[PDB]
Design a binder for this molecule. Sequence first.
Ligand code: HEM
Length: 124
Amino acid sequence: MSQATSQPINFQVQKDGSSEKSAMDDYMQHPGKVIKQNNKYYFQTVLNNASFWKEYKFYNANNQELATTVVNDNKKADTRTINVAVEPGYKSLTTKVHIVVPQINYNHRYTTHLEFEKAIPTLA
Ligand code: HEM
């Protein structure tokens, strides 16, 4: 027996070292989703142009690692739905991404910070 609850949560990805919107925000669907499944919380988000996202790690503001799983690597849509393990009360994630766009020889590693519109809630 398991139980799951979800609700939308919006967010903005911002540039390393500022609050300016990052280019990364344009490559993710909005809003995302908070899921609670058997008293574990996840932030679920969808990566657009998924083939460009070669690596993506998430951390909390204290540098703890946040396990990231892939729900659906949708090759037909070129999207990727991922779950990031979070805790209620988190307000922002640090992300470290490796983006590769082979046809323009673009191969970059970035740090950004993903700011939730409001802290991750407790769900019933
Ligand atoms: C998954 C796709 C992509 C992601 C996640 C992404 C993310 C980023 C990030 C995080 C930065 C650092 C500045 C910022 O935070 O906004 C950046 C820089 C940049 N990227 Fe990308 N990008 C993507 C695709 C592309 C593509 C397809 C191009 C085409 C050229 C591109 C061109 C650039 C340019 C021009 C900059 C800034 C260079 C400068 O500051 O002078 N990016 N990108």
